[PDB]
Amino acid sequence: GESEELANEYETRAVELFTECYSNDEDLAEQLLVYSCEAWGGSNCLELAVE
C-alpha cells in the first residue's frame, strides 16, 4: 500500500513537471523526451513511460 501511494505520487510529479517544461519551450522539451541519461536504467523517458 505504501509503495502504491508513492508510485502515484511520483507519476503525478513527472507529468506535472513535463507539462511545465513543454509549456515554456517546445523544442527543448522534445529534446528531453528522447534522451537516455547515459544508462539511467539503460532506457528513455518515453520508454519508461510506456513500460
Place this chain on the structure above:
Amino acid sequence: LQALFIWAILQNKKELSKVIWEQTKGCTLAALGASKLLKTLAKVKNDINAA
C-alpha cells in the same frame, strides 16, 4: 476602439483586453466577435501553447 481591441485580443494579452473592453460601446458584439476570433485561432495546429 474595436480595432485596438482586435489588436490586443489577437496578441493574447488577456488583461489589456478587458480594460479596453470596458470602454467600448458595442459591448456584447465585442465579446461575441472576440470569442469567434479566438475560437478560430485556437484551431491552428502549430504552437499549441498559443492555441
